[PDB]
Amino acid sequence: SQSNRELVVDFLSYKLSQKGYSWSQMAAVKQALREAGDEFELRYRRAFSDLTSQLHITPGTAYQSFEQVVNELFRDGVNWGRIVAFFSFGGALCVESVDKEMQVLVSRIAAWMATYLNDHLEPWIQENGGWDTFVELYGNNA
Amino acid sequence: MSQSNRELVVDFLSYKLSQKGYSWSQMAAVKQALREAGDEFELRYRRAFSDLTSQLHITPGTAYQSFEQVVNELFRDGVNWGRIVAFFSFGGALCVESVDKEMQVLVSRIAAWMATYLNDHLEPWIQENGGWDTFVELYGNNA
Amino acid sequence: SLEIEELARFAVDEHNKKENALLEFVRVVKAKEQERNSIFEEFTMYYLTLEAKDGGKKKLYEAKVWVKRDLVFGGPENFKELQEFKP
Amino acid sequence: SLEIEELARFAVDEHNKKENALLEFVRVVKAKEQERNSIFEEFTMYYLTLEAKDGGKKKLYEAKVWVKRDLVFGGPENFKELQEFKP
């Protein structure tokens, strides 16, 4: 019923997205960031391999180790491209974790990513017009 | 802090996992299977589906009864997973047609109509046929 | 193996109807099936080698028969179709 | 202006390297620039008209030079490439 509403909204959001429309501004941001991640992983296959190889997450990995490697993306400053790289980095660490039957780490990586956004990126995002601006600069919307 | 940033993290991780055949959650697996089924339906039944969509053009005047009457055709011979997918695809087509006519306000009404139709006419069959988890095992592309 | 014989009979009977021919079904020599059953459609393709008499003379024929049901817009009815029939 | 001069000088050098030629840069006569960019990459595209000496005689040449920047991993040190060079 509430699950049935959630399926209807997800499906309609997808069908609108396929034509360049969006359910909501949040749906448009989710779609733009999904697409941007795929483009990033295509364009930066080799350089991205170099970044993921620097952190093999185990149950004993501390946030501080993730924070130090992520900081490398942002040493020259924050921009939307580097924020996309940061999301792709998190996604690759999750996939790697599941591949190794260390599913326990997916929830932890999500928490780390939210910590890193709060601490390092959100001030820049809010003074640069928010995710609404990202969709304006990257989204393929009608 | 930011609940929007948390939602974008979860959405992006759900997507990346799904691309490798993994699922954030059982709900994420149901959503992905229905997205894929809707795509397959629209490719296979392009011609017959166009005969269904042509029967209803929604305007501010259109009552739920007119929507119900057309969707009722779909399920005349009974409910099955393929017809449920068609139902979702029909609603998707009505939402795209609405936005094409600069009437996005109708999208929320169509979503409400679809949720009403599901709970009223389809949920009893879904529950006695093993629910959406049955749909995923059968149809899902999962690792 | 019994329901294969009915499809082979159908292939001969369908070939005779369509080509104004009088081939006489003797038996199924061999049969292969490939299937695609989804939430949308039931599809079986049968490759039958059969023996039939053409003016009393037994000869070998291969027939391709398709059986389909559309689970979305179709009836309870299946649909048999002869695709190919050659010696 | 000095950045335009560098790109004109690069265009002549790259032409001479590619075509075993000896054109001598004199000056830039006009420069147009367009920008193409995504969140990952910046292109600044220069349409240069330049004067160069061919065997000591001044002639006009059109060059197209691209300056590319990787916005994710790149440094300040950009990448020049010569796309076209014609009299």
Residue numbers in the entry:
A (entry chain B): 2 to 143
B (entry chain A): 1 to 143
C (entry chain D), D (entry chain C): 4 to 90
Q: Mind quoting what the paper says about this structure?
A:
BCL‐xL‐AF10 showed problems during purification so was not further characterised. Both BCL‐xL‐AF6 (IC50=448±53 nM) and BCL‐xL‐AF7 (IC50=393 ±54 nM) were shown to act as sub μM inhibitors of the BCL‐xL/BAK interaction but were ineffective in inhibiting the MCL‐1/NOXA−B interaction. In the case of BCL‐xL‐AF6 a particularly strong enthalpic contribution was observed. For BCL‐xL‐AF6/BCL‐xL, the crystals diffracted to 1.91 Å, and the asymmetric unit contains one domain swapped dimer of BCL‐xL, with one BCL‐xL‐AF6 bound to the cleft of each monomer. The residues within the VRs of both Affimers interact with residues lining the BH3‐binding cleft on the surface of BCL‐xL. However, the universally conserved BH3 Asp which hydrogen‐bonds to Arg on BCL2‐ family members is not replicated in any way by the Affimer. On inspection it is apparent that the Affimers select a distinct conformation of the BCL‐xL domain. The binding groove on BCL‐xL is formed by helices 3 and 4 and helix 3 is mobile such that the width of the groove can vary. When BH3 peptide is bound, helix 3 moves to accommodate the peptide in a relatively wide groove (groove open conformation). When bound to BAK peptide the groove is 14.8 Å wide at the widest point, whereas in the small molecule and Affimer bound conformation it is ∼11.0 Å wide. In this case, not only does the Affimer bound conformation correspond to a small molecule bound conformation (thus this might conceptually be a better starting point for structure based drug design), but the groove closed conformation is also a conformation where the groove is too narrow to accommodate the BH3 helix, possibly potentiating the orthosteric competitive effect.
Pro‐apoptotic (or executioner) proteins such as BAK and BAX activate apoptosis through pore formation in the mitochondrial membrane; anti‐apoptotic proteins including BCL‐2, MCL‐1 and BCL‐xL, sequester pro‐apoptotic members to prevent cell death; and a group of regulatory proteins which bind to other BCL‐2 members (including BIM, BID, BAD, NOXA and PUMA), mediate initiation of apoptosis. In all cases binding between BCL‐2 family members occurs through the BH3 homology domain of one protein, which forms an α‐helix upon binding and docks into a complementary cleft on its partner. We have used phage display to isolate Affimer reagents (non‐antibody‐binding proteins based on a conserved scaffold) to identify ligands for MCL‐1, BCL‐xL, BCL‐2, BAK and BAX, then used multiple biophysical characterisation methods to probe the interactions. Co‐crystal structures reveal an unprecedented mode of molecular recognition; where a BH3 helix is normally bound, flexible loops from the Affimer dock into the BH3 binding cleft.
